[PDB]
């Protein structure tokens, strides 16, 4: 809601983040493509 | 029987693999182990050692120990003379 | 001490106290002119397990010797059977 009460505490926030992380990491998007996205330049040099 | 004693010497699964069993699964015949013992046996029972023992207090105080007359306590300097008394007792 | 050692000893001991041991002890107390101990012991006895089981009993002989000694030795607050009147206590009491 945004009320000082309705915000999730730390325990539920980690669990929630986990729910989302777990569900997204399956999709080829993350593991097949985005993980290699941030590699350095000479990393990509060596791989190519 | 120690370190000076004569030495004792020495893909798939072995016959030692089978007998073994996960403690999560219920065992063979349900021998009623006391929970406390199986805690201690497995190393997870909270220690009470002699290291956690402080001073052993005097609770009920004994008695007044009254002065017991010795041979060095005499109201005359005689009887303590060198020809009689070698020491207090 | 003997009375404790009678149930304590593994080899020569009885599991519970026999009658014999009870009247023997009581007889000793009587024969020592030991008053307080005789009383307490008697009461303790009838408070025991052996007594409620029926194993140990108070007999007539124990009872009457107990009473005899009760009579013949000084009681703290009162005068007792077997207190000999002193003729000369009139010096203080005033009565002969």
């Amino acid at each position: 809601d945004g009320a000082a009460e309705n915000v999730m505490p730390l325990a539920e926030t980690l669990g929630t983040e986990f729910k989302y992380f777990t569900r997204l990491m399956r999709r080829p998007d993350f593991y097949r493509v985005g993980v290699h996205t941030d590699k350095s330049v000479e990393k990509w040099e060596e791989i190519k | 029987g120690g370190p000076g004693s004569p030495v004792r010497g020495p893909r798939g699964y072995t016959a030692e693999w089978r007998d073994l069993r996960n403690p999560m699964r219920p065992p063979e015949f349900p021998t009623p182990w006391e929970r406390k013992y199986r805690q201690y046996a497995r190393g997870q029972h909270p220690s009470y050692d002699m290291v956690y023992a402080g001073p052993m207090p005097e609770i009920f105080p004994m008695r007044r120990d009254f002065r017991k007359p010795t041979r060095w306590d005499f109201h005359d300097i005689e009887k303590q003379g060198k020809y009689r008394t070698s020491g207090p007792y | 001490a003997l009375w404790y050692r009678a149930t304590e000893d593994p080899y020569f001991g009885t599991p519970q106290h026999t009658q014999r041991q009870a009247e023997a002890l009581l007889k000793v107390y009587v024969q020592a002119k030991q008053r307080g101990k005789a009383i307490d012991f008697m009461n303790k006895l009838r408070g025991s397990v052996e007594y409620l089981t029926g194993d140990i009993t108070i007999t007539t002989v124990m009872q009457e010797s107990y009473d005899a000694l009760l009579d013949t030795t000084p009681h703290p607050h009162l005068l007792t059977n077997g207190f000999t009147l002193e003729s000369d206590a009139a010096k203080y009491t005033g009565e002969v």
């Binding site: - | 009623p32 120990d65 306590d73 005499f74 | 408070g47 089981t53 009993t57």
Partner: protein, 257 residues
């Protein structure tokens, strides 16, 4: 320990000697008609823990006759340790292990009809329940020594009783038996503990008094010239210049006066 139907129900824990193996019993009758407490034979093998001191699980294993319910129909085995919920002291049984044939107590579903005998009551605070006025008195086996229906004050009257507790002004009141309680840390502090001898355990707490041979010349010198300091062995004496004498149980940490 609770009451129903006129009798006692106690929870207890049976245990091997090494306390390796254990069984809880929830509601056990406490019935003092049993010379010795009876268990089912099925447990004999459950409670057997073969330690180093007892290579076989038990010290004593025998056959006996003992048909109370209802020629060797049972087994005496022990020792076995028994913790009753009420009591601080373990009670060590050597119980009758009875097979199903000799006596079978299945009596109500799930209910094994166990009870506790005088084997175990003699060793408890439960024993105090066996004396006149207690809750086990009714169920004692009939004797010349125990009268069934007499009121308590009647019986106690017959023994010693006259009045209520400490009712006569001649007998002191029970609670003045102890007035002061001595705890060093809440009052006056710890003792100053010295010794003369070999150890603290081998000697006396006492120093030697002034009447000693070697102390007299010194103590003299101290009585005469009091203000100057004086050599001697007269120091080691229980007597000295200072108002505070050395004798045992000086409380030296005291904020006195």
């Amino acid at each position: 320990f609770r009451m129903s139907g006129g009798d006692m129900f106690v929870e207890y824990k049976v245990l091997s000697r090494d306390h390796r193996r254990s069984i809880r019993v929830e509601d056990a009758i406490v019935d003092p008609t049993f010379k010795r407490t009876v268990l089912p034979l099925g447990w004999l093998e459950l409670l057997r823990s073969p330690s180093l001191r007892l290579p076989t699980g038990y010290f004593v294993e025998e056959t006996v006759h003992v048909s109370l319910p209802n020629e060797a129909n049972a087994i005496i085995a022990g020792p076995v340790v028994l913790y009753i919920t009420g009591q601080s002291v373990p009670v060590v049984l050597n119980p009758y292990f009875v097979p199903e044939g000799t006596w079978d107590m299945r009596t109500r579903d799930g209910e094994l009809d166990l009870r506790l005998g005088m084997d175990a009551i003699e060793q408890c605070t439960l024993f105090s329940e066996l004396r006149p006025g207690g809750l086990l008195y009714g169920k004692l086996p009939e004797n010349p020594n125990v009268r069934r229906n007499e009121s308590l004050r009647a019986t106690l009257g017959r023994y010693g009783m006259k009045c209520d507790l400490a009712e006569s002004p001649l007998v002191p009141r029970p609670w003045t038996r102890m007035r002061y309680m001595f705890i060093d840390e809440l009052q006056r502090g710890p003792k100053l503990t010295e010794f003369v001898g070999h150890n603290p355990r081998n000697g006396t707490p006492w120093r030697f008094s002034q009447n000693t041979k070697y102390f007299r010349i010194g103590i003299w010198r101290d009585t005469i010239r009091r203000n100057d300091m004086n050599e001697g062995l007269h120091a080691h004496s229980s007597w000295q210049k200072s108002p505070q004498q050395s004798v045992p149980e000086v409380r030296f940490l005291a904020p006195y006066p």
